[PDB]
Design a protein around this ligand. Structure first.
Ligand SMILES: [Zn+2]
Ligand SMILES: [Zn+2]
Ligand SMILES: [Zn+2]
Ligand SMILES: [Zn+2]
Lengths: 473, 115, 46, 567, 193, 58, 33, 100, 105
């Protein structure tokens, strides 16, 4: 046996130099068998076959040798082999793809597909990916597409999904260059998260799925992003690519409930991360090139964010108020004259959008805008009234429920008195015009608040430290 | 309008051959929605409304060990009027192989009808 | 008389220049008549 | 045809020519040799007509490309004809040259000088030089004079073409207009008439035995007449320095004549200059192999429930049997010495060979051609060969190009309506809900298409499916309102893929009042019987409604006549 | 009489000094016919770059017969043959069926084209009894098969040892046996005899 | 995979390739790397490694 | 609407093909190919 | 290889000599009914796939209508290449042709 | 659209070199490699090519049966009516060859 088999193969190889190819094929067929069949080549003999093949791999690099090799790459559950034997399989693969890069394509595919397996069971797969990504950097191409190909479907088991993301995160941590494409893949799963949860707001399934996935993603990010990691690290890299994917996926689709909380949460790790997000939102909501609907969505994001994000500093908030009243004061000064001119009140979507956001911000954070004296930051008392009585008549065109709540609160705070303007408004209604073909999308857009409370059990608990519930404000 | 269709599952059999297919249901597992249109014999209850795709016939096929179903083909829905069992001569013994189903189609006079 | 004219074309080693309406329909080419009688080009700055 | 799958390569011309047996053998995916098509388990017989190298067939995958019955384009194979056959297309032309030949000096029996005069003229006509070809005839100043005449005509042709190329009048690709083509055709006719008009060879003075034919492509050789055998041996000293005749003899005769008379043939067989520089070969009139077309062009048919063999296969298998049978005659033929061996078997072997050649030649004729086949069992009516399939009934051109069965579109009885515009058409909702434009999704229409997708397949104006950027379709049919709302919210998501980044999704919507259709009433005898109307969807209607002002154009009567709506 | 034989490796790559290796970096001018997407109608050069050229970088390309390192001096050929090579307004013909343009371009490619016979140097990164694995210019894969290594060279557990009993390391000089190009990344087959 | 959107319809060299000195390879790598600052990222990374070697490093 | 056969041409099923007469063929999650 | 380049340059040069001097143009200075329709359709196609648009949409959702608007203001960046029957041609910009 | 789009519009492979639309096929690649589009007319059987310089790897392709070929890689796709393929097929049965000149070369 032990030495008999050593002969059997040694013969087989001689026989292969002669092209008979039978002996090898007998062996190959024996190793190709399924993990279940008792008649599959056993460890000890496999130990032998392997160590002999590794010792002179060039003997096999032939058309006659192809089938044998294919049969070993396709060895079922190899990661399941006993330590010592597993080690010989690994050394063989290592040896093979070094003298023949061609097979790395076949080996890695199977590797990636094993990403559906738990972390504890993949060490060998990553060890191998790390190794050959380094020595064959050109492989990153097709192996990236594998990342795509083998992503579990939304229907597939949660453990499959949760695993295949756990691994992708692990992969990210030693092959940075794939980092963006990875994050793009997870996010684009993104869309499935958008699917999960809004409509429902089986369903019990998607909840705990989407819940298991996000809680994972965000905790990995909490670790990836840290001050130490921000100065000399790839923390910056992660924030960037997550902010990019926010601008390209989350914001537009722009009716997601799963998913914008990744940004809500990473944001509030560090003061500058918040700063970067605010200014980023501000940018999108007042840029001259962008489409009005984008500007309106950002403004909803902006207002919802300031209201909800617990870790915000008084001054970052006053910053946003100071931007909005400033931008608003200018609008009224430069544009009120255009109202009694030809056109409709829609010409001013953007005005209402911003005034909404500011009103909304005042609802949640009015207690902050009183300085030590008891005076109002940004002269909110004097400012709100001016807009409310302007010709734009914000109260009529903004979200009805916010305008109402602002009325209540503003009146209570001696800040502004809107309630007669409201009365006048829905009286004129029973008896300043806007089509309604396009007037509805706006009412729709002004009703959505991307950081209204979460309904995913765990995530919610995790967010608490970062969230202000209405009851709190 | 009335249309008569002939369902004859002796159409394949090579002359006085063993009989593979018999009108009725087998004991394998088959839809059950089928009994909405079809009586126990595998023939449709008289009066039944029948639109495209519905069963008008059920038989058990021996070579398939399954219970199969001739479906209604017109895009115009109809009702079952007469179902005739056309037995065979040559002295009895033979079981049911030929049936005629007469459909009734409503014509409230339509646009494009000529007068 | 398809095969006659075909036989003639082969023995002449003819090239179909594809200019007739019939020929262009055969090969799936946009007709030489009509909105097809000129080309369109885009003026691009920078 | 999809506006997001552009094509860069473009076909600009087509060249007609002849497949050589060398090409065929090289390109072939499988040589077919078995008359039998299927086995007892309905699988393709290997080496038979459904051999899987010729393409996927039924369940099975193509053995050449590995593709399924859907993505496999099919591949051609070939049959090896054990003995050369005349290509039935060209037998008349073969006949002309054969008759024109001198079986002694192997030139055409027409005097070399004349033949050269035709070669000069035709060559000039390749360049469209009509005036010059008449001037060529203006050239004159016994065998010493003639070669100088030939020579000076030759230097005229060269000088004329050179001059024509230097100024505008031609390119190296020639010049080919109707007037040129007319002059060319006359000359070739004149040339052929003069070829067959000669008895005694003008060049060596001998008589060749006359050749006679069939309508079934057989060639007979009539032996020499008395005065003519006398004439021939008188010329015997200068040369010193009926019966069926096999296709192989004929080919050898023409092979040599085509070598000798190559110059003239080079222009008789090319209306344009022959840049390719290929020789004109006698083989072109013969076939040593047959191309077996791919399996997808030779599928069986189902007449309701019963399955019928493909008729082109029935014909090809007859070629196959005869082929095997001749390969056996050829096997016993070699197992002569007859160095020993008594003569007469010579007569019987010939008898069997004639039989084989005749019947294979008949089967080929019948296919190109059932016309060239001996009428079967007086009755039955012939089975169409390939020629008759291409030419049969109204023909491919009229039945599938002039006219076609069409896909999207609708048909209905028309009814009058004074309340739509004279340029509209009243569309019943039953149509409006099933007809979609494929609308590409953009910033300007995302609102609209969102709603359509939400509305679904069955609420008008809705949508029946979505095309993704990777071309794939998603059906909205089985779906709930929530699933649809989900898909509607991802209509305009960015690209997660560089390769499809230039594309947007498409929504297969129901059509609406913004839209235009093409209305048609047959017979369509002028263009106003096919006009564009603006769509106006009308609730509760079951017919197409058309303003009276259009009856004139369409010649419509409202007596239950129908129109087609094309979208 | 017939020449498909114009796909024969004509690299020629020169030997160097002060050195001993072959210089395989080369600059080749090309013409290429490419599509321009409608989104790039205001940025045609940008579009040609992002659609066609960028994807060529650091991949083997069958036509230049090497790995493309990069590109310089992209120019669109105006479909208006009457304009000056100067002007920044150009014509690009639009497909009949689609909104896409197609234009010719000229660009310059920098190509690493190791042909057979050349002498290269690699950094050893792996040593089994079956092959030696090297990295040329710290970028491209090389491999010397067990029996392209001279016969008196021996192996141990592992790492190779040469003719004189001393181990080999780091930089190694080999000659090109074949260049495999069809895989995910380029790979060089090298010999030492 | 390859479509008319990401792949040239045809490519042709217009001249014989001209060999370039190390000093030139370096000047080109320099500017090409600068001008271009996911597939492109991992590629300039590799170019960065090559320009390192042409300066003699690890 | 069932035929089980032809799994699904989408590698996050394979979920389970019924053919509609219009030849889309539809799998339950809602690929139409 | 060197001479195919030359061959191409000759082809392209003679094509332009057909495609002709601006100042030697001789066809109608009016846009033809055919040219108009195709210009509209083609520009509409480009709009449907996110071509930069040179005019204010003012609520329009039909890309054909957007094109029409662009045409009206003479902001369509297209050029018509008219072929004479010998294959030589005149380039006319959409903006310069008189539209009616 | 009707001839164009209803009719039988088909994107098909041509060999730019011999001008055929009938002699192309997909290569059958080793596992891991990608399939390419090749012309059976313009390529040599592998043996015969050896028997007449070194042969590049990208220049070899294989079919399903297993035969290796050298060359025949000058293919593209053109848009043709499907019925053209049928006509070309019938013509080659009769020994007749259509040769499509494709541009760009
Ligand atoms: Zn195939
Ligand atoms: Zn003679
Ligand atoms: Zn699916
Ligand atoms: Zn070819």
């Amino acid at each position: 046996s032990a030495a008999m088999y050593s002969r059997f193969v040694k013969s087989a190889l001689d026989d292969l130099d002669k092209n008979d190819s039978t002996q090898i094929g007998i062996i190959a067929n024996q190793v190709a068998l399924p993990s279940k069949n008792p008649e599959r080549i056993n460890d000890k003999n496999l130990n032998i076959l392997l160590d002999i093949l590794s010792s002179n791999i060039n003997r096999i690099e032939s058309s006659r040798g192809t089938f044998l090799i294919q049969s070993i790459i396709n060895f079922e559950k190899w990661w399941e082999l006993p330590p010592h034997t597993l080690s010989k399989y690994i050394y063989f693969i290592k040896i093979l793809c070094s003298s023949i890069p061609k097979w790395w394509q076949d080996v890695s595919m199977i590797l990636v597909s094993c990403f559906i397996l738990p972390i504890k069971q993949t060490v060998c797969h990553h060890d191998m990916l790390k190794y050959f990504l380094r020595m064959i950097p050109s492989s990153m191409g097709f192996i990236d597409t594998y990342l795509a190909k083998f992503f579990p479907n939304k229907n597939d088991t949660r453990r499959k999904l949760v695993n295949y993301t756990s691994n992708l995160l692990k992969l990210r941590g030693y092959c940075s260059e794939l980092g963006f494409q990875i994050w793009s893949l997870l996010i684009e799963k993104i869309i499935s998260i958008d699917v999960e949860l809004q409509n429902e707001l089986g369903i019990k399934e998607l909840s705990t799925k989407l819940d298991s996935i996000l809680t994972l993603v965000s905790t990995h990010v909490e670790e990836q992003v840290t001050p130490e990691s921000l100065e000399s690290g790839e923390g910056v890299g992660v924030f960037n690519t997550l902010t990019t994917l926010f601008k390209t996926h989350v914001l537009p689709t722009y009716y997601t409930r799963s998913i914008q909380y990744i940004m809500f949460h990473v944001s509030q790790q560090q003061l500058e991360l918040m700063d970067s997000f605010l200014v980023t939102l501000i940018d999108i909501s007042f840029a001259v090139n962008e489409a009005a609907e984008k500007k309106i969505k950002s403004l909803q994001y902006l207002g919802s964010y300031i209201a909800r994000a617990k870790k915000l500093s008084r001054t970052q908030i006053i910053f946003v108020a100071s931007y909005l009243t400033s931008w608003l004061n200018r609008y009224v000064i430069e544009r009120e004259e255009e109202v009694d001119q030809r056109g409709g009140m829609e010409r001013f979507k953007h005005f209402y959008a911003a005034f909404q956001a500011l009103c909304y911000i005042f609802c949640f954070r009015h207690n902050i805008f009183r300085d030590t004296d008891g005076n109002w930051e940004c002269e909110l008392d004097k400012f709100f009234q001016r807009m409310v009585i302007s010709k734009f008549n914000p109260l009529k065109f903004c979200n009805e429920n916010v305008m109402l709540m602002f009325a209540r609160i503003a009146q209570q705070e001696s800040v502004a008195y809107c309630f007669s303007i409201i009365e006048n408004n829905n009286n004129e209604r029973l008896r300043s015009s806007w089509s309604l073909a396009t007037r509805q999308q706006f009412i729709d857009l002004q009703s959505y608040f991307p950081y209204d409370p979460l309904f995913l059990k765990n995530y919610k608990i995790l967010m608490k430290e970062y969230y202000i519930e209405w009851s709190e404000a | 309008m009335y249309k008569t269709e002939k369902v004859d599952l002796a159409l394949n059999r090579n002359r006085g051959d063993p009989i593979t297919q018999h009108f009725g249901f087998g004991n394998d597992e088959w839809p059950k929605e089928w009994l909405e249109k079809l009586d126990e014999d595998g023939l449709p209850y008289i009066g039944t409304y029948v639109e495209e795709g519905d069963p008008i016939c059920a038989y058990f096929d021996d070579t398939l060990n399954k219970t199969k179903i001739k479906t209604y083909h017109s895009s115009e829905p109809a009702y079952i009027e007469e179902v005739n069992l056309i037995g065979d001569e040559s002295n009895k013994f033979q079981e049911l192989q030929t049936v005629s189903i007469k459909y009734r189609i409503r014509r409230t006079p339509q646009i494009g009808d000529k007068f | 008389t398809t095969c006659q004219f075909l036989t003639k074309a082969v023995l002449d080693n003819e090239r179909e220049q594809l200019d007739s309406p019939s020929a262009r329909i055969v090969v799936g080419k946009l007709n030489n008549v009509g909105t097809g009688s000129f080309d369109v080009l885009a003026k691009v700055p920078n | 045809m999809d506006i997001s799958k552009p094509v860069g390569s473009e076909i600009t011309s087509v060249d007609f020519g002849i497949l050589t047996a060398k090409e065929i053998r090289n390109l072939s995916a499988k040589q077919i040799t078995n008359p039998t098509v299927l086995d007892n388990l309905g699988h393709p017989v290997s080496g038979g007509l459904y051999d899987l190298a010729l393409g996927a067939f039924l369940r099975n995958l193509c053995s050449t490309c590995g593709l399924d019955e859907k993505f496999c384009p099919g591949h051609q194979g070939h049959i090896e004809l054990p003995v050369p056959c005349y290509n039935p297309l060209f037998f008349n032309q073969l006949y002309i040259y054969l008759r024109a030949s001198c079986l002694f000096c192997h030139h055409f029996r027409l005097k070399s000088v004349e033949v050269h005069r035709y070669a000069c003229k035709l060559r000039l006509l390749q360049y469209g030089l009509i005036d010059e070809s008449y001037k060529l005839d203006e050239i004159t100043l016994s065998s010493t004079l003639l070669n100088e005449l030939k020579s000076k005509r030759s230097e005229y042709v060269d000088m004329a073409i050179a001059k024509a190329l230097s100024d505008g009048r031609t390119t190296e690709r020639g010049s080919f207009t109707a007037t040129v083509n007319d002059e060319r055709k006359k000359l070739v006719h004149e040339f052929h008439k003069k070829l067959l008009s000669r008895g005694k060879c003008d060049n060596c003075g001998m008589f060749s035995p006359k050749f006679r034919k069939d309508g079934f492509t057989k060639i007979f050789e009539t032996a020499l007449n008395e005065k003519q055998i006398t004439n021939n041996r008188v010329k015997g000293f200068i040369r010193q320095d009926s019966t069926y005749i096999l296709s192989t003899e004929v080919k050898n005769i023409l092979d040599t004549v085509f070598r000798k008379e190559q110059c003239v043939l080079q222009y008789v067989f090319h209306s344009r200059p022959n840049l390719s520089r290929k020789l004109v070969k006698a083989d072109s009139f013969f076939m040593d192999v047959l191309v077996v077309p791919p399996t997808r062009f030779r599928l069986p048919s189902k007449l309701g429930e019963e399955v019928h063999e493909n008729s082109q296969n029935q014909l090809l298998s007859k070629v196959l049997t005869t082929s095997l049978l001749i390969r056996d005659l050829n096997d016993d033929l070699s197992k002569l010495q007859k160095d020993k061996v008594s003569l007469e078997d010579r007569r019987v072997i010939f008898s069997r060979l004639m039989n084989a050649f005749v019947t294979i030649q008949n089967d080929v004729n019948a296919f190109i051609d059932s016309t060239k086949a001996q009428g079967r069992t007086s009755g039955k009516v012939p089975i169409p060969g390939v020629k008759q399939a291409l030419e049969k009934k109204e023909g491919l051109f009229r039945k599938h190009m002039m006219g076609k069965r069409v896909n999207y579109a609708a048909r209905s009885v028309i009814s009058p309506d004074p309340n739509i515009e004279t340029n509209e058409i009243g569309v019943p909702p039953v149509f409006a809900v099933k007809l979609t434009y494929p609308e590409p999704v953009t910033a300007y229409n995302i609102a609209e298409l969102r709603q359509a997708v939400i509305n679904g397949p069955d609420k008008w104006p809705g949508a029946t499916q979505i095309q993704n950027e990777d071309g794939s379709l998603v059906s909205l049919i089985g779906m709930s309102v929530e699933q649809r709302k989900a898909l509607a919210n991802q209509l305009l998501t960015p690209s997660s893929n560089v390769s499809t980044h230039t594309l947007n999704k498409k929504v297969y919507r129901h059509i609406k009042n913004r839209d235009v259709v093409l209305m048609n009433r047959q017979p369509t005898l002028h263009k106003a019987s096919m006009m564009g109307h603006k769509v106006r969807v009308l609730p509760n209607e079951k017919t197409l409604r058309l303003h009276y002002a259009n009856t004139g154009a369409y010649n419509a009567d409202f007596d239950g006549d129908e129109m087609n709506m094309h979208f | 009489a017939r020449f498909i034989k114009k796909h024969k490796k004509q690299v020629t790559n020169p030997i160097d000094e002060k050195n001993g290796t072959s210089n395989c970096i080369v600059r080749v001018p090309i013409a290429l016919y490419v599509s321009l997407a409608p989104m790039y109608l205001e940025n045609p050069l940008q579009g040609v770059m992002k659609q066609h050229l960028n994807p060529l970088v650091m991949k083997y390309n069958n036509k230049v017969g090497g790995v493309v390192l990069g590109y310089e001096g992209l120019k669109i050929l105006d479909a208006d043959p009457l304009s000056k090579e100067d002007t920044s307004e150009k014509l690009i013909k639009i497909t009949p069926d689609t909104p896409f343009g197609f234009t010719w371009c000229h660009v310059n490619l920098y190509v690493w084209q190791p042909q057979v016979g050349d002498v290269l140097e690699g950094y050893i990164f792996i040593q089994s009894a079956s092959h030696i694995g090297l990295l040329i210019h710290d970028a491209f894969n090389a491999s010397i098969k067990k029996n392209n290594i001279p016969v008196d060279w021996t192996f141990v557990h592992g790492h190779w040892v040469d003719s004189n009993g001393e181990p080999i390391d780091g930089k190694l000089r080999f000659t090109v046996r074949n260049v495999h190009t069809t895989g995910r990344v380029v790979s060089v087959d090298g010999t030492l005899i | 995979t390859a479509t008319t959107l990401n792949t040239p319809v045809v490519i042709h060299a217009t001249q014989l390739p001209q060999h370039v000195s190390t000093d030139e390879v370096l000047q080109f790598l320099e500017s090409f790397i600068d001008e271009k600052e996911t597939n492109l990222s991992s590629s300039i990374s590799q170019l960065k490694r090559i320009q390192r070697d042409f300066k003699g490093l690890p | 609407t069932f035929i089980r056969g032809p799994i699904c041409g989408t590698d996050n099923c394979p979920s389970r093909l019924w053919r509609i007469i219009d030849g889309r063929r539809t799998c339950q999650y809602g690929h139409v190919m | 290889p060197e001479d195919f380049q030359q061959h191409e340059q000759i082809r392209r040069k003679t094509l332009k000599e057909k495609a002709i001097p601006k100042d030697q143009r001789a066809t109608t200075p009016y846009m033809t009914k055919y040219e108009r329709a195709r210009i509209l359709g083609t520009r509409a196609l480009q709009i449907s796939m996110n071509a930069p648009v040179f005019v204010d949409l003012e609520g329009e959702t039909d890309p054909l209508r957007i094109a029409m608007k662009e045409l009206a203001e003479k902001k369509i960046p297209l050029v018509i290449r008219r072929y004479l029957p010998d294959g030589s041609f005149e380039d006319w910009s959409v903006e310069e042709l008189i539209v009616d | 659209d009707r001839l164009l789009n209803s009719s039988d519009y088909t994107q098909a492979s041509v060999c730019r070199e011999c001008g055929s639309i009938l002699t192309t096929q997909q290569s059958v690649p080793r596992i891991g490699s990608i399939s390419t589009v090749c012309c059976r007319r313009c390529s040599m059987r592998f043996e015969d090519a050896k028997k007449l310089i070194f042969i590049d790897d990208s220049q070899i392709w294989e079919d399903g049966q297993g035969n290796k070929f050298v060359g025949g890689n000058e293919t593209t796709t053109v848009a043709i009516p499907f019925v053209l393929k049928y006509l070309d097929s019938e013509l080659s049965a009769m020994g007749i060859r259509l040769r499509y000149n494709v541009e760009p070369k």
